[PDB]
Symmetry: D2
Subunit: 487 residues, 4 copies
């Protein structure tokens, strides 16, 4: 960064936006300058899309093993760049050492996963109901894929989409979140060093409503995979319809963490603190609504607050043991203030926390909450967390399902019957028994239901999203036809 | 004859009592009075499906299979009734509606056969002491919106497979084929499916359809119809983040190379391009012949076209072609003929029309600017284009916004596979018709022809979702608070 | 008077030899049945072989149709099958009802799946190459079955094997020939092409051995004793035919201290003693946590005492019929004799008269008891007390067998840890050891056999994969190098 | 490396060591009989020690996450890439392979190891629909246990590594006994595994006689599965011996593959393809084109071109340079057998078009026409460079000759006609089949294997996993119910 300018990566070349316009990226930690970055426009997006389109047929037609080879090369370059990624995830994104280390380790597994699976994505040989007929189904890549990503886990979320989409023979136009441009540029550095053919991967840094919208509305883009807010997702889905492009949407969550009366209460509290407050609660599968059985509610709350008190908030560059960094910007702090203020004025009891300074915001924990609190009705993408007390499992489920979202969820209990009945009844795309709500592996179907979006990503589920089935037959006998009937 | 909605286990009038009269495309005679439903009727059906959903989804698959096998039994008793309505309401010939009914029987059976066998996955976990599996869950209430050309088989493919995996259904048939829809509801009623699991609402697309597409308790919409309609449904669906399956028609190429049995190729081409008056999404709509056999192919093709018998499809079992579905279709076919003549096309045969009947109009001296090369021609007007080699055949084949199916006729294994690979379509057939279709294969298109696949387990993929579930068997330490 | 079914014709053995089958209930005559020999077996095999190409080559939908026809016929024949399963096999009403219901589902399951068995389209590592994998039927399949559940076991094998385009030579157990003949009646009425299914009734060492050793038989699927299975496996090697072997079990039922003890006892009694314990997946070794052992044993014996043993023909509520023959009674006495001599405590049972046997329950057993070391295919059951979960698993696995198994507990961690640790082909949490569905992989590990049967798993056993490629470009070859 | 810093030893429980008895044999080159190395002559004790070492390593290897095992295999891949030249040198001098043959085997071996690593994490079970209420029903995949791996001498590296890598990937442990004519290749494999640091006992190498070490592996009660490639007779004996403990087997037993050539081909190309397919590695390939079947309309021109290219083949010391076409057969016993085949064909009236001479272990390709079905070279697997050409009148005839064999491994047809290609493919009785390519096409992840006398099972990628794992049905029942006994209740 001290020797290179941040730039777009289009058709194998690093370069400025056509207008030359730029923005200054600052750190959420202390407001210091990180870099000037492109402020691209529609012409830049169009150039990337055309580059991706022109590269597509050669990239889709080579054998899978050759695409796997490029991905293994990418993996090798990533391993060399780990420290650079960690550094930027911390200073640009505000992530602690432990968070960004976790993100980089997972990203390494994601890239490897995509490389591993490329050669093995199979179609099907079918039984034909007709005689003398061969009937099979091939897998084909969709084409040019737009990749639009958020700021909270910008590396791992970007690379899950990019690596798997590339593995099955799509080409890519990537637009990172405006708050995390340097992470996207480092990804382009990685891809360039790995030597992928020009145009196969393109980076365009610029405003969502401009560059993103051009990607979503362009006729040469076949598919858009998007992670962000539910409202943005709805807009993208609607704009995508104009050219009938398919979409993958992961739109956040208000995941329930349900704690029953038979748990190890102290472990439950330790687990709950991690699940609800890691990365300052800025995780789509954060445990955003904690739901506790009344028989252990008092000890659980005391214990949860006890460990929350221990959380160390600081400049995440200071050392490896900082627990929480800042939120990404001042808008998030203002929003978390609204959440706290709304809860207090509604009669909610603030057990602990509530202070903020600059972009830093302390955990703010509430009890005595009801369903009309904003922190029960909206995704709270920050460290404000309600605890709800319930009398039985039926109530646990009612509260857990009383949300527009449906991403993940978890139950803690040692009873196999209660665990399975609750897992079945909770309306979520993912569910975890005796673990955190944000469990994620590189090759499992990650995604939600209801307002949390559509589709699944991870391993072959990513492949399902960015390929199509192609039924092909061969008929080995001639036959007579019904018209003209006179014959 | 009076026809009604079927909502929550009950046949009933629309809540406004409004009705309208349906006439035969064959002679204009009255057929039935059918509902003109409104949004309130749609909402009632939707609420009934929603209320029925939990009970229907949570019984074992084998029970839903049992209901589908019942439906199969009832359908078998209603075959002749379905055939008559498909002919008098839809204009189909005996041979056509017989085929549709036989295929429909297979579709219902296929859905029943597969219900118990739709599997999730057990995964390898990257973590110790973790069980990691993926369940299949039904999406919920599914809207089913269908066209008029093959109103029975298209409807039942969607309805039977959607029900099989534990979805409930709100069904709105095309306005030109309401009685077929009503008969479907009769069959379901007699199979005794629980109230609200299946609902029929007959009404205008822009009113009843739009309510289905925009309602927040509908989880998915599967649609077959025009690409323009599909695009608008997709846009409306976005508001509540419901998913869609869209089959939006085609302009399929039929490619004929120089090594064929030319007479056979002509016979095959006539059937593929003009069955059901070409009113088929996978009709062979653009015929592409190699120069070396073109003259002989064209002569033979027109020869067999000339032999086609056009008549009242009620008359006997050997009528080849019936009428088009309405006068709007006839007017559109005239636009296509008008455009082709004005651009220098040579009208080898056909073009005569009377009432809703139309004699297949065949053109040569065609180029890429003709409307019949640029648009889906959902009727009996067909271009034959001559190409000099396989590269050109492929160039012409792909020079379309559509991408549903396609076919190549040749005995050469290399040319067959190379062409199949290069043609941009969701489906492709070597040495057969463009409209090949089986009950359990992935049917659907690319480009403007739509999104998703239907048929057997592919239908299940469309109307279920994956649900990752884990069990962790060991406790561990967490990274925050670090002071711990 | 029953007969063979060979190449579409019901006929008597070549020799005309026959023998008289009697009821295990009272020794009365049931029927005269064939005593077939080698040449009868060879005739059946040749018929199946000649029918094979035409049967394998029709579209799957045609075979499904025949199976749906067989389902129709079976539905009409339910009462006949139930009658014969009771009087020939000694089964109670409730047992043979269960068997007939499951058999209906088995036939249906095979018909449902016939059209849907898929191969794979692969990615090629080479340019211009199409690479796919087809499924092909193995060919003529020998089916050799036991006497305990002669209908459902036979029909699971027969229906699924037919579905994917194999032809069948079927030799039922000598103690249950009439059931096999009724199966042949059903297939004849369903009108399957001649030679596609064949029945030969005769002695295992004669008819069975010819099936197992014949050139034109491609596969044998066998259910019976481990010793017989080992013999069949050895004989099969001569012609390189594949086998499926289901060889019984000594399944553990593990009961932990957090259960509903009364419910566990009720479950245990059903699991361990239904059909007089003559089930491959019977709960044959009951393993109970010390904290609930006293109460469990008390309630278990209480329910055992309530079992009504009688002529199974009398009415629909007889709990237990007789064992299949005198040999079984004699073996059960050997098991009782050994347990007593080693210090076992006989809590109840042991009485026997004719082929009837009152369930003998032992405590104070150790690992050297024959009823802990061998499959006890009858109503003699040990209960073992353990101090903790590690010991429960140790005892559960201390067996040559590995078919099924079960744990009763409400603790999710304990249930899963034990499920993982027990060495068996199948396992069930909070249910009986002998759970079985038509479409699940049924089979064991260790001495319990090889392969899996049920739905598509049956299809895997009696088909093979066939890799086919098409190469669409020419290339240069490395020899001769000078070229 | 140097054949004379070579000692060759067993590899058991993480250590390289001598056989229990100290017994050894001398491995000589087929090229000139030169000494390559003293190698172990192990006995049953060494086999038992290896088996006990694998058994004791099993639980910890099977229980770690698949990703751990994949990591070990990726490490093996890294080490293999460093040893490529060493493997090529030993395949040539020990096995008689030409440069081009051993380069191909080493390239394929690299892909095989990588393939096994790639697939480890992705072998899935199934979640099922239960017919019962309140029941969860799933199927897990579990490794079989200790796996015996017994291999041949013709492609000793790639065949061994296909078996070893995939078997290790899904959590089995391995006892490996290489062919006695290719021990140094097996030792280099153990060196690779050792340098990759796999846990002790997970992989073991025992070098010794098949009827001693091999039979102990096949009969031992703690061995769960044997995967074997060799002669059909050996295979039959192994299958019989394995029955004693009910262990399962994978058997790839050779072939007599048909190469069918129709009248519409490019005849010159068909001849070039046929030469490569029928004679590469001196025809010592299980999927060699061993019976050439040609349509009478192109038979004369095909035979002339085929014999022309055969005559062009350069036979020489494979160590000489990179463009040698054919090396020696593996030993003098193979030359003697090929001589029997030639003599039997001459004596029966066969027309010897070219070749049939031999010197040392080098055998000159012998091509016959005017044969019939009673010729040994039509009735037996001819694992060497003696090849019959049969002329047929039509496709029905082509298929009848192609199927007139006890074997059924692979097959190929050359034609540009799609109907003839597909009809012939469907009709030929083989486990594998290739339209317009060589009979011995092989990829790392496809199901390789035969039918009839050619064996049982499939190896390659997920198909190797199917062979060395079992399905395990597990249920959870979430409701109590009433039971039918005691009925009084
Ligand atoms: C299972 O089944 C076992 C008990 O049933 P079972 O008594 O019927 O077992 P079984 O004695 O092994 O007999 C099973 C089947 O194999 C046949 N058989 C016996 N010897 C044979 C041979 N040398 N070759 C081919 N077939 C042969 C039997 O015919 P025969 O009835 O004529 O002996 C019978 O049909 C238990 O272990 C349970 O777990
Ligand atoms: C394939 O491969 C064949 C040629 O290879 P090949 O000569 O190596 O075939 P092979 O003679 O059957 O031997 C293959 C492997 O099996 C071993 N073997 C021999 N007898 C055995 C026994 N009784 N038990 C266990 N293993 C035994 C061999 O060891 P030894 O080399 O020490 O005999 C060798 O490692 C071709 O014919 C084609 O069919």
């Amino acid at each position: 960064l001290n020797i290179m300018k941040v730039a777009n990566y289009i058709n194998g070349e690093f370069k400025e936006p056509s207008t030359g316009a730029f923005q200054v990226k600052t750190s959420p930690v202390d407001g210091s300058k990180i870099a000037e970055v492109p402020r691209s426009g529609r012409e830049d997006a169009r150039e990337a899309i055309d580059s991706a389109f022109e590269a597509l047929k050669a990239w889709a037609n080579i054998p899978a093993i050759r695409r796997a080879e490029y991905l293994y090369k990418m993996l090798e370059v990533f391993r060399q760049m780990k420290e650079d990624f960690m550094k930027i995830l911390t200073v640009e994104g505000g992530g602690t050492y432990r968070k960004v280390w976790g993100e980089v380790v997972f990203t390494e597994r994601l890239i490897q996963n995509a490389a591993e699976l490329a050669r093995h994505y199979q179609g099907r040989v079918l039984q034909s109901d007709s005689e003398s007929t061969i009937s099979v189904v091939f897998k084909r890549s969709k084409g040019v894929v737009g990749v639009i990503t958020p700021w909270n886990y910008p590396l791992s979320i970007s690379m899950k989409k990019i690596a798997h989409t590339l593995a099955v023979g799509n080409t890519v136009v990537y637009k990172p979140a405006s708050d995390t441009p340097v992470t996207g540029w480092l990804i382009a550095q990685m891809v360039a060093k790995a030597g992928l053919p020009k145009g196969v991967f393109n980076l365009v840094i610029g405003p969502g409503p401009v560059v993103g919208e051009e990607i979503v509305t362009h006729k040469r883009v076949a598919h858009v995979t998007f992670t962000g807010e539910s409202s943005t997702g709805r807009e993208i889905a609607a704009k995508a319809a104009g050219t009938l492009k398919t979409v993958t949407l992961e739109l956040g969550g208000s995941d329930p963490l349900i704690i029953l009366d038979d748990v190890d209460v102290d472990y439950a509290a330790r687990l709950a603190v991690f699940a609800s407050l890691f990365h300052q609660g800025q995780i789509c599968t954060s445990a955003k609504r904690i739901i506790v059985h009344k028989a252990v509610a008092d000890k659980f709350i005391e214990r949860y607050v006890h460990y929350v008190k221990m959380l160390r908030i600081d400049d995440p560059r200071k050392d490896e043991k900082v627990d929480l960094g800042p939120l990404i910007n001042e808008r998030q702090v203002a929003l978390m203030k609204e959440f706290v203020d709304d809860a207090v004025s509604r009669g909610g009891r603030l057990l602990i926390g509530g202070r903020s300074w600059g972009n830093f915001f302390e955990p703010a924990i509430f009890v005595d909450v009801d369903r009309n609190f904003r922190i029960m009705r909206e995704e709270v993408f920050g460290p404000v967390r309600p605890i709800v007390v319930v009398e039985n499992d039926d109530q646990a489920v009612e509260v857990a399902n009383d949300t527009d979202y449906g991403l993940s969820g978890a139950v803690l209990t040692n009873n196999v019957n209660r665990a399975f009945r609750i897992a079945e009844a909770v309306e979520s795309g993912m569910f975890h028994i005796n673990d955190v709500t944000f469990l994620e592996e590189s090759h499992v179907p990650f995604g939600g239901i209801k307002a949390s979006g559509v589709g699944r990503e991870g391993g072959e589920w990513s492949f399902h999203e960015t390929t199509y089935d192609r039924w092909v037959t061969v008929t080995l006998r001639t036959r007579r036809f019904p018209i003209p009937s006179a014959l």
